[PDB]
Design a binder for this molecule. Sequence first.
Ligand SMILES: OC[C@H]1O[C@H](O)[C@@H](O)[C@@H](O)[C@@H]1O
Ligand SMILES: OC[C@H]1O[C@H](O)[C@@H](O)[C@@H](O)[C@@H]1O
Ligand SMILES: OC[C@H]1O[C@H](O)[C@@H](O)[C@@H](O)[C@@H]1O
Ligand SMILES: OC[C@H]1O[C@H](O)[C@@H](O)[C@@H](O)[C@@H]1O
Ligand SMILES: [Ca+2]
Ligand SMILES: [Ca+2]
Ligand SMILES: [Ca+2]
Ligand SMILES: [Ca+2]
Ligand SMILES: [Mn+2]
Ligand SMILES: [Mn+2]
Ligand SMILES: [Mn+2]
Ligand SMILES: [Mn+2]
Lengths: 113, 113, 113, 113, 117, 117, 117, 117
Amino acid sequence: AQSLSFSFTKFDPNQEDLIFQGHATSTNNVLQVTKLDSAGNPVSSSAGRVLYSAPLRLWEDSAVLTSFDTIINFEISTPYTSRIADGLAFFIAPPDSVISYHGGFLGLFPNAN
Amino acid sequence: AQSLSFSFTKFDPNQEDLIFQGHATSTNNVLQVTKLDSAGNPVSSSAGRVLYSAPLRLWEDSAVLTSFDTIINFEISTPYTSRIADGLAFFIAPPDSVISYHGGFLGLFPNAN
Amino acid sequence: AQSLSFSFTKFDPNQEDLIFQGHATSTNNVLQVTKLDSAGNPVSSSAGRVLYSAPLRLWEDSAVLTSFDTIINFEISTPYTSRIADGLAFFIAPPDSVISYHGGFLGLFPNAN
Amino acid sequence: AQSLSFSFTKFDPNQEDLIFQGHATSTNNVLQVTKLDSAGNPVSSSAGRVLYSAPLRLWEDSAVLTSFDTIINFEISTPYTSRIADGLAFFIAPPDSVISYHGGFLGLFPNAN
Amino acid sequence: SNVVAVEFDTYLNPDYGDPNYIHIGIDVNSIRSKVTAKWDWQNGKIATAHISYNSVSKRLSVTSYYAGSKPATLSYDIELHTVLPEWVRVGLSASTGQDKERNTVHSWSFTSSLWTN
Amino acid sequence: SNVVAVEFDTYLNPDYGDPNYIHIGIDVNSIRSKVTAKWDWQNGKIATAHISYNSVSKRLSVTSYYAGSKPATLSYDIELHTVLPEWVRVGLSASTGQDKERNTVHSWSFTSSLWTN
Amino acid sequence: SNVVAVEFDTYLNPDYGDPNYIHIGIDVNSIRSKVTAKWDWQNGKIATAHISYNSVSKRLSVTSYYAGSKPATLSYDIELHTVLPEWVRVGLSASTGQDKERNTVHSWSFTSSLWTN
Amino acid sequence: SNVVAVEFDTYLNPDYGDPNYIHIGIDVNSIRSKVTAKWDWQNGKIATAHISYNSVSKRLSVTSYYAGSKPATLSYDIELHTVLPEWVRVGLSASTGQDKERNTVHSWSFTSSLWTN
Ligand SMILES: OC[C@H]1O[C@H](O)[C@@H](O)[C@@H](O)[C@@H]1O
Ligand SMILES: OC[C@H]1O[C@H](O)[C@@H](O)[C@@H](O)[C@@H]1O
Ligand SMILES: OC[C@H]1O[C@H](O)[C@@H](O)[C@@H](O)[C@@H]1O
Ligand SMILES: OC[C@H]1O[C@H](O)[C@@H](O)[C@@H](O)[C@@H]1O
Ligand SMILES: [Ca+2]
Ligand SMILES: [Ca+2]
Ligand SMILES: [Ca+2]
Ligand SMILES: [Ca+2]
Ligand SMILES: [Mn+2]
Ligand SMILES: [Mn+2]
Ligand SMILES: [Mn+2]
Ligand SMILES: [Mn+2]
């Protein structure tokens, strides 16, 4: 009935086929989902999200098999010596989903229920 | 750098991953890019267009090979005995493209230059 | 490290890219893994197997994810009114594997251990 | 009717799914289509060929579109300072094809007609 | 109006350039087809069309058959990136006027690749 | 005899382990199915089956439907690489004995991926 | 808040449920992970993660390695379509608070299939 | 000797037809290239080449770059099925003679499709 497949190997500055929420951006061909110090150092209280433009069908009444595979290459680094926070996540949410609170929330949830 | 591939084999009524312009719609699992008589007969002066949700990168400064392949199954039929009009087209246009005049224009162009 | 993908939608008479064992053959674009009456009726005590030419890597010392998906369209039919036998199977076996006993064995195993 | 797709990103020592002809071999995860000095230096008068195990359908009576795309990453290097010879080639030949003369022949042809 | 389209034309418009017969055409920025080929339309049956492009062979090609009959082929040399921008959306479009016809699509499959340096 | 097979069994052989009904089974090194599920065979019509494996979810799964009816599902946890060697060939097999049935295959599609470190 | 996420957690929040160590988690509608596994993070290097789902094996699985070291694996059984709606968008998300870390993504590849009757 | 090959030639053999410079060539049944283009070889670095064919655009094309420099392109019109049989095997071949060079291959990726009626 439906099939969708997409691949990214560099991240163009003007990525018309991605949706950007929060301090998420892209430079030097990578995705900076978290705000950055004009010197290239991580900042505090930042939340960034990226969503693939197109919606995706996950299920349908008369349908019986749905499958998805995704591979991600990400780098969590810190120049500092303090503890590192917070998280990196791959998520699937209703199309109109919007970024939530930061911290140990990963811009995914508002509270802790 | 980038790759996009999608497949449709039925057309769901609520095709969240398609953009609809004009009298284009979908029922009985097919795409009716042209308005229809409540009895199932073709009407006059109709224009319908469908666009894949996601934008597509066609070219880039430091890039050297771009290729696309698409297969389409369409049916042009008429119950009547008069001449049939007008056209069916596969097109690639800037993302914000909007439907144009009908007739032998195929909702693609405004004039005839 | 490795990826293999193949698709068949018709079965040519001379399928150079398949290995044939037993009464397995092909005509009218389909795969007849079981012998047939010159009138087109199923026969008794028949065993047929087909193997994709190329070997397939299933695992490797420093490797961590192996996955395969296959879809099959098959038809088990009988013109007669007696009970139908025996079985249809999709199998993965060492490359030099050879057809075994028929019956409820499915040309897969010799005994019943 | 048919589709075949395969990918290699490393070359295992025992590549059961490749056919080897000539001094072609594999070590350190790469394909050495040309013989090598036990010190890792190129030798003279060498011919090596590799063929994908499975046969490939290129055409058929009632068939109308055949397409293939292949990407290759190869390295032609020489430690010496003399002129480098001879050639690297991607070829498609009948299944039973066997390696030919070396030199500027690229193990592809016997004479120069 | 910017666009590149491959068209299966059922109604002839000589004032628009259409040759005198059901044709399939490749259009670049204008309904005035750059190249055209005779297409044997068939009421009721369904058609399959493949369209392919390659920035290197600088060629765009179309082949359309009807299951059982001979296909129709058209090729035009272009360097798409001189005609269209860097970002595009792909679509199917159909229309009518004084005269009608049913414009229906059954399965549609599209795949694209871009390679950089 | 080494092999892993998913079977659609039409003839019951209680002495071989077959439960009392047309079933689909997952077999590891023996015709004595490790797990089995009721399959509603249908003479004349054609069946579609998907079989999937994943070294991480250590699960092998089958689903088979008949276009119009409810599907049949069976899952068994394995770590294939402990049962089979590093190099394998994939095949379809069918057989008969005192009793017959037509064993025909229409399209077959297979894709595989392996990832190293 | 509706969502299903796989997370690579660097900061521990016991009040939020986080066990006492850098972990990767599968979350269904809450930051309170349903299942969790120890992940050996590594500053500066880049990580590769594969996430896979199958409506039949009703299993969602993750494996993440670091090129050279041992991977980390986590699996949770779900029937995604009971938790999420019929239409979804897929994304990557990263955050910080009193404490920081660089959240960067290098290549991302995703493919999905759905089959009906 | 039957074969179609795309070649990256490092040693010139004027008696064999090779123009006077490192070139890439398309060959049909003979080492005597039908068409040829200047290729800027580079010792030590690795090269990426894409070769594509289409029975409709009756064109075979090659593009080879070196990561950082300008690519090299060659196209030749053929109808492969008039030159080669219905069944073929695809391969990579390299050779030397009085003079040497290391012939090594790193990843190789190939995909093919055929469509009937
Ligand atoms: O019906 C087809 C025909 O109808 C009218 O004459 C106009 O709208 C034309 O542009 C169109 O080609
Ligand atoms: O016909 C089916 C049945 O026939 C015979 O009894 C034997 O060959 C059995 O193994 C087989 O199951
Ligand atoms: O810096 C990490 C930490 O910072 C603060 O304490 C809060 O924002 C927490 O939610 C978060 O986990
Ligand atoms: O070394 C390259 C050169 O060596 C010899 O002269 C012969 O084998 C030639 O065919 C070849 O081109
Ligand atoms: Ca946390
Ligand atoms: Ca017209
Ligand atoms: Ca049995
Ligand atoms: Ca030469
Ligand atoms: Mn026209
Ligand atoms: Mn059984
Ligand atoms: Mn957590
Ligand atoms: Mn030459």
